[PDB]
């Protein structure tokens, strides 16, 4: 697993790149996959820069923090822009949770340095909403 | 809901105080409540500084980020300190997730300020592992 600030931030950046693609370039694919009639689905981004919409981890507690569950359920009950914003915020929160899981053993200064790296990338919420 | 940097840190510090108590002073009761015989359980910390072990939220998708699911399923196969450390890191991650959920509308410099305040308190993992 990632342990150094550099390793963790590389992992963060790769997962983020995947989720950014899901919510922008591939947004029509992502949206279509989130059918409200299916079982609870989550949006995952992986360090190989792939994104997927899938069921949550079958075995619990999961090795990593898990994304928001059941994002598909609300898809057809709100305007698209509002649903994508909801997905984006939960995705930003998940990326942070994953990095600081890997970063549990970093000291206070290292954790601040890692957040600083993360904070130099616009949030998915910023991107999807087109924030000024 | 908390919106300013200060409001979000107040909420964070109260939930953290609750979780820290569960993992230390109240650990005998907390450990007991994480019954492997039950369905999947979670550890919640609330802004009134109460901690609670309960099933996950039924409202799906939930409003707030959700804590780690099924910590009771890991309790008996680990040494107590290792299990508490696992709960501690997932709980630290949940606290961060909750704060930056409330903080989604903060800008880059506001989020930096918020993290600086959060980063002024030892993490739950810091305390549980003796760092």
């Amino acid at each position: 697993s990632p342990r150094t600030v550099e390793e963790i931030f590389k992992d963060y950046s790769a997962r983020r790149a995947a989720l950014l693609r899901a919510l922008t370039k591939d947004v029509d694919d992502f949206y279509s996959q989130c059918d409200p009639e299916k079982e609870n689905l989550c949006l995952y981004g992986h360090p190989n820069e792939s994104w997927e919409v899938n069921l949550p981890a079958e075995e619990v507690p999961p090795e990593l923090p898990e994304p928001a569950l059941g994002i598909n359920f609300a898809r057809d009950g709100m305007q698209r822009k509002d649903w994508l914003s909801l997905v984006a915020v939960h995705s930003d929160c998940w990326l942070l949770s994953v990095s600081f899981y890997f970063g549990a053993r970093l000291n206070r200064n290292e954790r601040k340095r890692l957040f600083s790296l993360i904070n130099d990338l616009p949030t998915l919420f910023d991107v999807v909403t087109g924030r000024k | 809901s908390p919106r300013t940097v200060e409001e979000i840190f107040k909420d964070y510090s109260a939930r953290r105080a609750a979780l820290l108590r569960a993992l230390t002073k109240d650990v005998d009761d907390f450990y007991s409540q994480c019954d492997p015989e039950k369905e999947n359980l979670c550890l919640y910390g609330h802004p009134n500084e109460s901690w609670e072990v309960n099933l996950p939220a039924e409202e799906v998708p939930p409003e707030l980020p959700e804590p780690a699911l099924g910590i009771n399923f890991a309790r008996d196969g680990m040494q107590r300190k290792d299990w508490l450390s696992l709960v501690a890191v997932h709980s630290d991650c949940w606290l961060l997730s909750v704060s930056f959920y409330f903080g989604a509308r903060l800008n880059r410099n506001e989020r930096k300020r918020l993290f600086s305040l959060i980063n002024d308190l030892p993490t739950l993992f810091d305390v549980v592992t003796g760092r």
């Binding site: 949550p56 075995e59 619990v60 | 999947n40 099933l55 399923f73 890991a74 196969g77």
Partner: peptide, 8 residues
């Protein structure tokens, strides 16, 4: 075991 299938 330290994991089980998630509850239904």
């Amino acid at each position: 075991t330290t994991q089980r299938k998630r509850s239904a």
